[PDB]
Amino acid sequence: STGSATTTPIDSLDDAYITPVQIGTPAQTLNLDFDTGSSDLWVFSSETTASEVDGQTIYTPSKSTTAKLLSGATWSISYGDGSSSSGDVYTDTVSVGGLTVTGQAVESAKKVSSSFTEDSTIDGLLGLAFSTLNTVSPTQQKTFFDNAKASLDSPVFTADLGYHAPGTYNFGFIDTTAYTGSITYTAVSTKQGFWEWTSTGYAVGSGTFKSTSIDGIADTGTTLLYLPATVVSAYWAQVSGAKSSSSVGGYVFPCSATLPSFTFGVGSARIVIPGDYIDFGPISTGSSSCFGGIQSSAGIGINIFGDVALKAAFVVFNGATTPTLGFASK
Ligand SMILES: CC(C)(C)S(=O)(=O)N[C@@H](Cc1ccccc1)C(=O)N[C@@H](Cc1c[nH]c[nH+]1)C(=O)N[C@@H](CC1CCCCC1)C(O)(O)C(F)(F)C(=O)NCCN1CCOCC1
């Protein structure tokens, strides 16, 4: 089997991408953020504290004939940006783009943090990291991909995110029309539960490529590209007037600037991020100071190849016995 679904930016800046997901019988369609940085499939629900719901579409398990409460199971997660959610667990039928999993763990939120309430466009998350990170207690649950994998034509999914435009998530096949050149594959470490790999280096604009190992994760649920302070300083030094702002909490630049591209290495191959992908707009409405899309990872502890980087590539998440990651230009 296979599946294919379109993913859409939630706003004009590509802060995040949402993908429609069918849950239950009859189907309830929710727009979820596909997140290769976590391993929980959770949704706004009829059980969510009503004052914490403000415009989201909710899952009502009582209206699904295939939903079953998973007795005694609960979940609770905290994300890198400080947001969080928690609740109880159902098993139900879940379909993505024509690919169906029966008996998927659907984590129903009883509580969400203010940042979730305040964002009406994201109805929940679909985690695509390794199932060792799943937070359900006392019996850890498998991800959508792990459940689907043996049925798939090939044990893979691909991410093809758009710049200021929709893109595609595919399951079980590689669309050879969706990229240029060849796919370069690179090793993955699963020891931390992530799609962790090592980039071979970087270049700024038309500059010389610097060969250096940069360990990081491929993370569709993070907006920005977080890299070592040395690399980040080298980038923003090429932008007149850019600076690290204490009050904003990262690099800002004049909205009148033209930004250089950023290149990262995948083995002997190279992925080029155009400069406009690195512009996230005014820091506050009406400001002439704009937020940068490349930021330091120093306060985070790991480098993160978030959407700014991934949307420049066609990315293969190969879930074979020994996982690998593939990157192609497009
Ligand atoms: C505005 C922004 C300054 C650019 S922001 O950073 O707030 N944007 C958010 C994404 C966003 C956009 C729009 C609306 C809502 C949220 C962002 O990029 N958040 C990252 C920031 C980050 C990364 N690393 C450190 N900080 C994040 O937490 N991403 C997680 C998923 C997000 C959470 C908020 C809602 C959207 C999905 C994440 O899963 O990718 C993760 F990998 F960082 C993460 O937290 N992984 C959790 C892993 N735990 C390990 C222990 O076992 C349980 C699993």
Curated annotation (Swiss-Prot):
Enzyme class: hydrolase
GO-annotated molecular function: aspartic-type endopeptidase activity
Keywords recorded for this protein, A-Z: Aspartyl protease, Disulfide bond, Hydrolase, Protease, Signal, Zymogen
Domain Peptidase A1: 17-328
Disulphide bonds in the chain: 255-290
Superkingdom assignment: Eukaryota
Recorded catalytic activity of this chain's protein: Hydrolysis of proteins with specificity similar to that of pepsin A, prefers hydrophobic residues at P1 and P1', but does not cleave 14-Ala-|-Leu-15 in the B chain of insulin or Z-Glu-Tyr. Clots milk
Residues at the active site: 35, 199
GO BP, sorted A to Z: proteolysis
EC id: 3.4.23.22
Family: Belongs to the peptidase A1 family.
Protein name: Endothiapepsin
This protein's encoding gene: EAPA
